Amino acid sequence: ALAPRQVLDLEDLVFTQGSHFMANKRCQLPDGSFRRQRKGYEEVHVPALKPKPFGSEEQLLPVEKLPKYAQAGFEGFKTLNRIQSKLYRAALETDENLLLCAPTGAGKTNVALMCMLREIGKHINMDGTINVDDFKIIYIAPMRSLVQEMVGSFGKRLATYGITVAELTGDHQLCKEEISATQIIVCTPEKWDIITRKGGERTYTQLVRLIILDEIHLLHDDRGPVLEALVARAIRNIEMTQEDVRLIGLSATLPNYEDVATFLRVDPAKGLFYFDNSFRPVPLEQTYVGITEKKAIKRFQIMNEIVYEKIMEHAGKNQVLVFVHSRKETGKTARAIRDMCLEKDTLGLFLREGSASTEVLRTEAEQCKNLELKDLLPYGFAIHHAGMTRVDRTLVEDLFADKHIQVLVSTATLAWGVNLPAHTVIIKGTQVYSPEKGRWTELGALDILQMLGRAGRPQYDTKGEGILITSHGELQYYLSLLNQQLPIESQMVSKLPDMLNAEIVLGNVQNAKDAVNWLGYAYLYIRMLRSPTLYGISHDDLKGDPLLDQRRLDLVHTAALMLDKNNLVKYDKKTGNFQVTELGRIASHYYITNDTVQTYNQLLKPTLSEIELFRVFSLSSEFKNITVREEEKLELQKLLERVPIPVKESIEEPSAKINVLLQAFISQLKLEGFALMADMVYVTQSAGRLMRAIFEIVLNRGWAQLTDKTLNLCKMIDKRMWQSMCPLRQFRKLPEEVVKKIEKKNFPFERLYDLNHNEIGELIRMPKMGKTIHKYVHLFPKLELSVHLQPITRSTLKVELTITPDFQWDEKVHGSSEAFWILVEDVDSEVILHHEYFLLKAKYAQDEHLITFFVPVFEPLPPQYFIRVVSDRWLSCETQLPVSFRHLILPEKYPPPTELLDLQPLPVSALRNSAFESLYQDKFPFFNPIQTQVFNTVYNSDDNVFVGAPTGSGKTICAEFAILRMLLQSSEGRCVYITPMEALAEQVYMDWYEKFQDRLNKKVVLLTGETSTDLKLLGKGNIIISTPEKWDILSRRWKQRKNVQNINLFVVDEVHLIGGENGPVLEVICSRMRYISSQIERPIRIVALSSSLSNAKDVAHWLGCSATSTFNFHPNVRPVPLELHIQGFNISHTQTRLLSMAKPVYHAITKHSPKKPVIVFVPSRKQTRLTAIDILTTCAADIQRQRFLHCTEKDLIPYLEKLSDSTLKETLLNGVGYLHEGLSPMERRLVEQLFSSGAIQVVVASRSLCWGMNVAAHLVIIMDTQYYNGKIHAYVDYPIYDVLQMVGHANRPLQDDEGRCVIMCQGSKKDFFKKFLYEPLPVESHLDHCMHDHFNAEIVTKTIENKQDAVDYLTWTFLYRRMTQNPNYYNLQGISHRHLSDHLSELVEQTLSDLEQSKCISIEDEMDVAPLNLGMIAAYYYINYTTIELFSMSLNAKTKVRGLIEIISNAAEYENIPIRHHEDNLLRQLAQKVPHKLNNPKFNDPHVKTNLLLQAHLSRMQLSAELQSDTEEILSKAIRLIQACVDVLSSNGWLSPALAAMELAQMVTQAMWSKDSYLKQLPHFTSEHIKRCTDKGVESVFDIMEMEDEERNALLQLTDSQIADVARFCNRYPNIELSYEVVDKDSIRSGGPVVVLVQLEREEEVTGPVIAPLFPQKREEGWWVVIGDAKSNSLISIKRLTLQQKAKVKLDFVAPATGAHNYTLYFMSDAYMGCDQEYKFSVD
């Protein structure tokens, strides 16, 4: 972006005066102007503008004529203004941008209220009052008092609608619970500026529909720029969001209004309104005076003379008000008026001619006041300023509204924050004091205009009188300010650098080019275009650049050079690109000037003292022109000794002045010099932001001591107290005296925790205060800290800090939340090696919290680290914990990785078989380096090999390599491929089916999970592939299963998932395969593919891999090089961090792959949709439009014509695809196909899909890297394996010479990612935590029998190898073999005891153990022992279907069922729809969630997509669990419970409740036809299949495809007749075996599987035969069977004594409802 540009002296082009850069050469005094000179005391008097007619339809509109709802806001008014009528039409009936130029006091408020009511009534419900969570309105006001007046009045007006208005302007910040529950935010421009330059501005700006800007003439003021800035951002955002917001502007009658109309994007014909002062609310006659020379006495006395004359002129029923510029001047005015009244015969008295009483009566009666109120109130006068109480201020205001107070002198605050008008207004002088300029200046425009607009009460005056007193040399200017002739200019050039940085930091300006465009968005651009001479531009240069390219480029270049000098931004001369500094980011977010940044960066140091800290604070360039006046030096010397910090920096120069003023603010020391008070206030209202800025600067750098100093200084400024004082001062309902008494005694605060209330009262000598002191002591926040550490590597330790609360919560004291900083410091407490922002919410305030993070350690290992948790707001609220590293081992360091040499790549010709080459020659001509190296050992050496290489580097085909010789050595061999994830298994199954059974014609299958079907598929396949669970349940019985023994090849992929959840299953199945290879004496070849592991040798020796077969490569030695970019976001609240990272993903796309494909991963599905849409709208804003679409819309139309999601159609035809599990697999494969084709450039995917997508990009972006766990009501970091898979998705060697990935994460995590992603990953076993189930399952198979071989088994585990090299990770404190064996024996003992207490095993002596019924059926159904124990203890003799479902939902396998954000609310909603209602339900409990899901499924209820996937996950194991329940119910002998359990099985199959019609089971059916049938006679499916064809088809009244789909279910319906015989019936007596034989016939053969559309897995008929006694509720015998036409069943059971033994024979199903039989019989 090279272009000619020259640096500029911005001082020449800036209007130095500001506020009043007089562009008006001469003010044309109106008609009726006379100038009576009196040598000073001149009177340039203009008349009141006479009224105007109502000619052109103009009329005061009746409030009843308004739209009916909007009449609520205008209640109390029976009409509205003329301006208000024209604007009623415009504003209430249109959404057009508006700009109202009207004189001061003309109304303004009510027209903005109409604009608000537009939006308020847009979101109406039919009978719901409003949609508060849908629209957010804001109101920008120039002064704080105006903000407060506005929020009060607007609340009063529109409370009827149910809206909530509030003020955000205050010294507090980062507190935003009110922004959530307030629909109309009133704020100052700089407030909204600091809010909307914060990252994640959308959190506030998302629901913004209406932006009002009151008193837009602020553009001329020095505060002008921020306004511009605001508008610019807003407008640009309404372009980037494509969500229109309405801009309302309110200005006074001043010129250049058309330019701000262009600025505000108002149509001059539709939204531009201008009213000259003939539309003034009360016609105003004004007089201006001048001063002759410098005579203070003369000035003040002449002011007083004018005041006395004009006040006396308005004696009765009139109020002549006076405005002063200081609180020392209102008292002086009262004094002077009273005195010169007295001096001249005390005349003017009895202004209220009812001297006896009237108003004097009420004044004296209400006289219980202070200061100068009690004397001037009966006299008739009054004063009003900020240094008064609320009661007395409101009392003066009331008695003035009562028109009983006559004269009132006040300051500008009354004119801004109170609706208090008067007949006459006298501006006493116009010189005010500015601490910013450090000098006396002239007043601002807004003050003068608001004050002189107060003249003339609205309904009580026919004419007003404004009187202004100033100097002569200013007259012509004030004449311009009050007669529509002072032009509005732009002060942007002086504020250009700062502003520019705020846009560089905000990411809205990445180059100088969009900087220039932004400058075009400003008011400065328009104002330069239409008056270039006063902006430094010639009329010829305007011809050269009509769009002013050169001037805007020069300006942004100067600002960028300034920001580069001060190091807020790095700016390169050539490309014109910007790069943000953390200095600049802090400067923007904390609203501080770049010179201050430079001073900080050159002065702040880790060894800085608190004295030097106060000095640096005083050197801020916000105070660079403050002066030490002689009139205050003695008071400064007095304050210096009364403050604690030395202030050695100087003597009595401005830095020492600032310092001592701040310390007098902290110490609450009173002052006397009024200029000194003004300067103090000006320093203190900024000191908070300045100190927070310094604190962030030092925190990010890790400097610990300065961090503590600075945070404490922030809190001392906030709470108005030093650290020497007692923290009890922070409770503001405590006395000052009592806390001073506590401080007098040298008893530290902490010991009050361990003290009686009576002993407290005795210590303080105040017994009555002791109870409340104890209360507040236990209300003070204190945290308990507990730590669990486990080494990960010699450089990194995993820490699990457990934060426990230890105080009473009070919403008044602590509010909705309490913030904390977690800090990890080294031994010297110098360097902060890690830190985090913790937040204790109010709801979970008493729950325990767990914080996992990682710290670094380097040898020589220090004795201990420190972990401090320090409150962000409370002083002396720190809890420290030393973590000792004295008994900590450092894990055995890993060796270097197997180097990949630069060897000639092997072409496909090395693979000699032509059919084998066929597949690999159609893709690539030669192999990549790592697979060229691994080829020798894998495909041609029958060695056990482990290859470790980054994800996506093409390691999969390496397995194929081995497989090749596999198929070469055996005809119909048996190889087993094991992958941890299911979706990866499905992808590799499709690929290898295409590669083998469809190409080589060798049967390749993937195990489905059902026992019989999977064991059948086992024998067929030459290649069987599976997940570790389906393979575990098959291989656990490797004695009876012959097929699992003759396995030529076992390949396990992604073995590094041993360390993740569901990892112990992989570990045990691999160890079992190794043990089988040992026993069979036929060495099963093992080949393992994994990521780059550090401890790859351990897993290599685990599987018998020689070092000639270990292939573990440094992750840098990828086939495709990768450029990783970790990018931190120091933002806590994740819902706002996502909105912040919004724009960075677009800028990352444009930076790292502007044309090439990208994948961006997000933590949700709604996030996939939203990210797709926001990328779309940003590309529309840039008008790139087709940047992400590389084909034609007509090319896609046929494809997208079959997609069901409308937004997916739109986003796809616009270039970007989204992949979320809320849509069909067909849509997923379609989007993947379009992406890999090149038509779709970018795809945004849910995290859950990072395993099952066969899609490669050039750039992989990751968002957030956190997801919400609602079981702990917090956010969890991603598993490292997921993000590593995502990163591996970035390397494709098809096209690119490089791979690019950027991860966007909270700062707390950044370091973490970096390290573990740049170097190999250490992995360990979690088998010791999930070991009991495998012992319970291998006692059943007799593989384990005693304790010694239970120890022998662990030798096969990876756990055995890892417990040695990393002891402390498994909490063993030794590395000798003694420690190993001791830990193993303790583990086996613990597991066996836990299993015995569960009634699953029996132990005898100390060796031999034996299975029990519970453990046998727990291993038979692959069910956890806890679930079986719970089943056995909970199932009672009389358990009904409701209790059946309850006990089912409590299973441990359903604890994995998660709880996500806002999901507790959805479960609350579902609780009232399900037929059975459980009391005392906790809605973050997975078990009540599963119960609700089961009740909704049985009731055939549709719900969310995530909840549907969860319902599928539960239904997968539902039948397993209910079969286990049937078995234990049989083993305990209860009859009707087991019958109800079989009923529950067949209920969960086809989603039928227990007592609904059986007709509900056939498909294509709703309740109306079952109502017709059951009312007319058809009650069962047998009635359906008994009817003739035509009478049924007529009874159906359905389509021809419906009858065809009904017939298939009516045919699959089992039709079985039973045959039962009691063998040797005549030969039966007591105690003898009784044998009942049962036989079954099925007319049709196995036509197909069980038909159940609402069940995900295709099941097969399972039947149950039962012998029961219906009276004893006794189940005698039972058998489950699988039926194929012919059956033969036997049931043997003993007999009791002779009696009426009437038995029942039950035939139950586990699938269908209504095909169950009950036959009574008798045997004696």
Ligand SMILES: N=C(N)NS(=O)(=O)c1ccc(N)cc1
């Ligand atoms: N970045 C780290 N080390 N921690 S943080 O939670 O992300 C964080 C949060 C907020 C602020 N202001 C700074 C930092």
